[PDB]
Design a protein around this ligand. Structure first.
Ligand SMILES: CCCCCCCCCCCCO[C@@H]1O[C@H](CO)[C@@H](O[C@H]2O[C@H](CO)[C@@H](O)[C@H](O)[C@H]2O)[C@H](O)[C@H]1O
Ligand SMILES: [Br-]
Ligand SMILES: [Ca+2]
Ligand SMILES: [Ca+2]
Length: 339
């Protein structure tokens, strides 16, 4: 049993404290107070934000909060958020509980938004068409599959084609909690497409963020409780082969990819106890990593922002646009910063 307490302390990084890395002009995004756990910025500076999601056992400040997709135009001087209206008749909006998101832009420049949805106990991926002028999301399709039991994030490679992380093997939240505490490491990654759905990697200690290189040749997978980012070669038939594993002293959550450089921008939880077992007197901090030249022998890892949560609690995602840094959290606020 002594080895079991030791594994727990490592996985949840229970002794980690946060050396500050400050940025002089950071401003909280007004209107975001109950989570902004995933976000994605289009090439034109429009940012989608998944907000208000509720997860089994995750702290929530407003238990009756409703899940929303928000829009920010980061070309504005002081960008404000607006709530995107979901239209259509193929989705039960009352149970809409968004988590990870991804975008896909077609040849005709149609923008698709894929949204992990956790209505009740089940797990789906919702496909929307973005209507920019109307600021709305037209629902198109609900995707469910036996190989998508517990979806956490996806990276879209087509309008209804994506890689998905399942952060647990089990669907029942009690068995989920048990599997996470035991550290079974049965989390796995699924490739979904209309004609072909298959597991492409497995054996993860909670796979969370997932993303892809701008040329589509590599897939990146955050293994939250192992504190690792896995680099996979992505083949023409959509299978994955392991290539590199980077290790960290922090719980890596969601991965963003800068399209110009290919850099990874990662939202991280330095101490796992503070993000999983909330204590208002001991709140989770925030930490953002930039990772450059991830294939080379010594990848350059920089802590771009870090704090103990006196401003932003529970950073889960971070992405950059034309000199600005946007940081989201699993159940708290959002921060917009000059780099
Ligand atoms: C409680 C018991 C519940 C059993 C039902 C689940 O069934 C179980 O699924 C897990 C998840 O892939 C499998 O686990 C398998 O893959 C995992 C992850 O790659 C490996 O760590 C493990 O060594 C291997 O056996 C088991 O082979 C199977 O027995
Ligand atoms: Br922390
Ligand atoms: Ca995502
Ligand atoms: Ca997460």
């Amino acid at each position: 049993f002594d080895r079991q307490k030791s594994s727990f302390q490592t996985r949840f990084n229970v002794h980690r404290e946060v050396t500050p890395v400050e940025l002089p002009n950071c401003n909280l995004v007004k209107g975001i107070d109950n989570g902004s756990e995933d976000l994605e910025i289009l090439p034109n500076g429009l940012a989608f934000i998944s907000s208000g999601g509720k997860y089994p056992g995750i702290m929530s400040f407003d238990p009756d909060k409703s899940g929303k997709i928000l829009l920010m135009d980061l070309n504005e001087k002081e960008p404000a958020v607006s709530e995107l209206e979901i239209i259509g008749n193929t989705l039960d909006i009352s149970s809409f509980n968004p988590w990870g998101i991804s975008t896909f832009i077609d040849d005709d420049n149609t923008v698709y938004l894929l949204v992990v949805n956790r209505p009740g106990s089940s797990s789906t991926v919702e496909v929307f068409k973005f209507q920019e002028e109307e600021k709305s999301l037209l629902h198109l399709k609900t995707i469910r599959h036996k190989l998508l039991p517990s979806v956490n994030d996806i990276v879209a490679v087509g309008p209804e084609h994506f890689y998905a992380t399942n952060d647990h093997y089990f669907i029942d939240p009690y068995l989920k909690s048990w599997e996470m505490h035991l550290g079974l490491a049965w989390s796995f990654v699924t490739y979904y497409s209309p004609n072909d759905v298959r597991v492409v990697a497995e054996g993860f200690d909670s796979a969370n963020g997932i993303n892809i290189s701008p040329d589509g040749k590599y897939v990146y997978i955050a293994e939250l409780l192992a504190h690792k980012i896995h680099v996979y070669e992505k083949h023409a038939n959509w299978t994955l082969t392991p290539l590199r594993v980077l290790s960290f002293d922090t719980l890596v959550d969601n991965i963003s990819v800068d399209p110009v450089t290919g850099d990874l921008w990662v939202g991280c939880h330095p101490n796992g106890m503070r993000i999983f077992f909330y204590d208002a007197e001991n709140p989770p901090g925030s930490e953002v990593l930039r990772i450059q030249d991830i294939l080379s022998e010594e990848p350059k890892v920089t802590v771009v922002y870090a704090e103990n949560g006196t401003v932003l609690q529970g950073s889960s995602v971070a992405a950059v646009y034309k000199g600005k840094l946007l940081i989201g959290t699993v159940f708290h606020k959002a921060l917009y910063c000059d780099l």
